[PDB]
Amino acid sequence: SAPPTLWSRVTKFGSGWGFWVSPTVFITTTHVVPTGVKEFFGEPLSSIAIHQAGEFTQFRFSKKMRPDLTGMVLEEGCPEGTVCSVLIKRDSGELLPLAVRMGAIASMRIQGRLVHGQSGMLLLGTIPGDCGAPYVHKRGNDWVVCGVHAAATKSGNTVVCAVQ
Amino acid sequence: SAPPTLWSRVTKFGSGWGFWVSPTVFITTTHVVPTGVKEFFGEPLSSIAIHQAGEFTQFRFSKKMRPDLTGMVLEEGCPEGTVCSVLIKRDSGELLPLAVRMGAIASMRIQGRLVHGQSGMLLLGTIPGDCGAPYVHKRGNDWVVCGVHAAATKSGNTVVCAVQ
Ligand SMILES: CCOC(=O)CC[C@H](C[C@@H]1CCNC1=O)NC(=O)[C@@H](CC(=O)[C@@H](NC(=O)c1cc(C)on1)C(C)C)Cc1ccc(F)cc1
Ligand SMILES: CCOC(=O)CC[C@H](C[C@@H]1CCNC1=O)NC(=O)[C@@H](CC(=O)[C@@H](NC(=O)c1cc(C)on1)C(C)C)Cc1ccc(F)cc1
């Protein structure tokens, strides 16, 4: 089970969620980012370092936004067969950790866009507001984040996280 | 260390917090409850059974609001000497559990009103926005909630939870 502090990194953002990797680094999927705004979390966009590609968006703020957190390891996906937890927060406050057996890392075309992602099989599914939720796993003594929720098939049995 | 599901019961409400004891029962303190609203969590006030006893307020909703939750043990305070955790969330999303060594249950005047509460000694103090946070402890294998945060002395050393 993921520690409470790890869940506390999952933050409402735009039309979904994002995740604090460190006091200054926030990750989410590109579709949930709000547009037509001049600030994120009260910080002007010109003050934020941004890397956005393949449906993965990373922000690095110029001040400590979550000084309570330790910077954790972000990896580009995980080994095939890893069982990740998708840390889904629902608007009720429910915490819904979904177990996913991860498959291949690949570039895919989803609704006409290039996603650099990893597919996995859900072990009762994700919904539109869940985009941005982190995929995490425990390696030895440390938690690792390796993607953010981006898509699922119509049946709902398969999910895709964007990776960086 | 409280599990994530226990933290997920801590819910922003009014000027502070409240706590889901069960899918239908929500507790908070009287001073946190907002006036001039027509709804709580989308439910009209007239559809909720609201019980106020001194500084303790409980809502019983007529629909399942948190059907993910099991109903837990709500006790009228705890044994003297128990070290509780007060499950405080701060505005950033930071989790700030505070340890409190509990003292006596009593009827005490706080700002002119006789409150049924349990005092304790904090072991980085509490702030106005923390009212309604739950006082919890683990008894054997089960977590127990025994009050909600209501007050603190000017010095900050003594806290009071309202009990029912
Ligand atoms: C701002 C709008 O976007 C959002 O709402 C983000 C939240 C939802 C979450 C989905 C929503 C439902 N269940 C879920 O888990 N995501 C999407 O809708 C994505 C599309 C799908 O999930 C589709 N899946 C595939 O095409 C698909 C193909 C494969 C493989 O896996 N999924 C449909 C389920 C809509 C949006 C998207 C489009 C192009 C991309 F580059 C990347 C993403
Ligand atoms: C609208 C106000 O609502 C709120 O903000 C609720 C949150 C704060 C949290 C305090 C705020 C600061 N640090 C804290 O932890 N609570 C209070 O302010 C309470 C008053 C006190 O804390 C006072 N304490 C005592 O009198 C007192 C006596 C003993 C014993 O312990 N505390 C003062 C700290 C203001 C409000 C109250 C009044 C009459 C009652 F029936 C019962 C409660």
Author numbering:
A (entry chain A), B (entry chain B): 0 to 122, 132 to 172
Original authors' sentences:
Their active site features a catalytic triad with histidine-30 (H30) as the catalytic base, cysteine-139 (C139) as the catalytic nucleophile, and glutamic acid-54 (E54) as an acidic residue which orients and stabilizes the conformation of H30 (15). The substrate binding pockets S1 to S4 in the HuNoV protease, which accommodates the P1 to P4 residues of the substrate, are in the cavity between the BII-CII loop (beta strands BII and CII, residue 102–117) and the DII, EII, and FII beta strands of the second beta-barrel.
We chose rupintrivir, a previously reported nanomolar inhibitor of human rhinovirus 3C protease, after confirming it to be a potent inhibitor of GI.1-Pro, yet simultaneously a poor inhibitor of all GII-Pros tested. The GI.1-Pro – rupintrivir complex structure shows excellent pocket complementarity accommodating the P2 to P4 residues of rupintrivir without undergoing any significant conformational changes when compared to previously determined apo GI.1-Pro structure. These comparative analyses affirm that the S2–S4 substrate binding pockets are more flexible in GII-Pros than in GI.1-Pro, in which the S2 pocket is constrained to an open position by the H115-E75 hydrogen bond. Surprisingly, rupintrivir shows no significant change in covalent inhibition potency against any of the GII-Pro R112A mutants compared to their respective wild types (WT) while showing lower potency against GI.1-Pro R112A compared to GI.1-Pro WT.
